[PDB]
Subunit: 298 residues, 2 copies
């Protein structure tokens, strides 16, 4: 089908490919993996240091095997060879993953990474052509409460949720603020992360969500939100909504959250065990009643 040129690369071209990103700092690497096999065609010399891994081991892994299993689905979704910009018009959408250095399921430490993916072709000949590849610019990220430390007036993030109180969207600013990746939140319920003493508050919030539909956004009472290291952070939030213009019902609820405290353990990404068993009791109670009150048109 009448196609424009590709720009094909080869193995020695890959050494320099995004040296601008790889020189940014000591947390960045570039990986190129084949859409055919899932194997690494090129990865930066510094990636063994950054993943705490070994150069040999990595030239022979499938990239996905490095990924935390929670993240494999976002990986496949965000790297589909069909959404991908080519590599230089609007182009390049960040996702997140935890990636380990592939140790031995005991010494395996996952760090969170921010990824920019691009499409690329390389070298050899199969039955037709030169190798479709993903170019991945990777960067280790840090808890917003360490080191640098996101300034206080910048500790803001945005989320949206369904009338069923299920998260639809979370902007990337949340990640170093809460220690979760977007995929951890999407499809889960906001109520789960809330302090129990604070969940009933959502009732009045969604009542205001109706009252103020078509009106500017409102504030209410702060709520404690559980970061992934387990400690709570106080959200000071503004809320509003989008009502479907045709059936005038609330389609989603939107929050801009100012994070007003810091946890004690400054590392929101610290490894934690947490029991996820029995707890959806008062949760379905609130979800059911909030949903219910939200069918009132307009």
């Amino acid at each position: 089908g009448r196609l424009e040129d590709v720009t094909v690369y080869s193995l020695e071209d890959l050494t320099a490919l995004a040296s601008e990103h790889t020189s940014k700092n000591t947390d960045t690497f570039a990986a190129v993996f084949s859409f055919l096999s899932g194997r690494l065609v090129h990865i930066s010399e510094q990636a063994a240091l950054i993943l705490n891994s070994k150069r040999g081991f990595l030239k022979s892994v499938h990239f996905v095997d490095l990924l935390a299993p929670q993240d494999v689905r976002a990986f496949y979704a965000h790297t589909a060879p069909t959404q991908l910009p080519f590599w230089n018009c609007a182009p390049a959408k960040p996702f997140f993953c935890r990636i380990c250095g592939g140790g031995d399921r005991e010494k395996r430490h996952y760090s969170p990474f921010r990824i920019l993916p691009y499409l690329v072709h390389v070298h050899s000949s199969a039955q037709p052509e030169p190798e479709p590849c993903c170019l991945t610019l990777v960067e280790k990220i840090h808890s917003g409460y360490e080191a640098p430390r996101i300034p206080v007036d910048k500790r803001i993030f945005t989320t949206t949720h369904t009338p069923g109180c299920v998260f639809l969207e979370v902007d990337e600013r949340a990640v170093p603020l809460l220690g979760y990746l977007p995929q951890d939140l999407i499809g889960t319920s906001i109520l789960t992360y809330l302090h129990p003493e604070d969940r009933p508050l959502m009732v009045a919030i969604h009542q205001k969500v109706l009252k103020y539909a078509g009106h500017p956004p409102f504030e209410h009472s702060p709520v404690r939100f559980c970061t992934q290291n387990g400690e709570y952070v106080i959200l000071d939030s503004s809320w509003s909504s989008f009502v479907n213009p045709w059936s005038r019902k609330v389609s989603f609820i939107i929050g801009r959250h100012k994070v007003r405290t810091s946890p004690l353990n400054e590392d929101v990404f610290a490894t934690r065990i947490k029991k996820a068993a029995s707890n959806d009791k008062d949760i379905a109670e609130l979800q059911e009643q909030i949903h219910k009150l939200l069918l009132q048109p307009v």
Copy 2:
């Protein structure tokens, strides 16, 4: 529930239960659209395999008829043919000689062109879309599938502009001007536009538009349209082979839309 059995269906619907961490389909309903075999991720079109995995990842699946399920789509077929199918994936558990599996049960519905066999009523030829300030599709409702020929995965991430008749594209500038002007008000109509269905032929779309404005950064966040096809396309099967398959001259248009859509309101 925890067993080894059955739910049947019928008439361009059938069930494939397949082995989870495994491969081979356990069960398959006596109904077979085109020639037997005994394999299943294998029956999918190249470009659909990514969706088939996303929507059937064991964690996303709900339990069967519990005490809830959401569609995805693929083309899941000389050599080959490929039809469109609507799917509902579930997690269930099955017995074998191998001392309970993990098991995904899927209910599969062959999809017809809204125009072919049992045509969709004219009053029901409505669907909705959303796109960014940069004219890229974010959301497409299922009801677009039988009407355009494309599965949502073909359209999400691509540009509205691409699909519009070149004759019709520059209405988009004005349609976006009105979006700013009618921001905060109920939907508006503007001149219609023609949309290139998957087979090659165009249809007229009569639409209303509105938008969602970010409440803090007072700029348009996305644009929503509800559309109604006026007129059957030249070809019946909106899914049929498709003939005239390059073109640019779009990019400038989208910078213009994107630039004008920067105005806070």
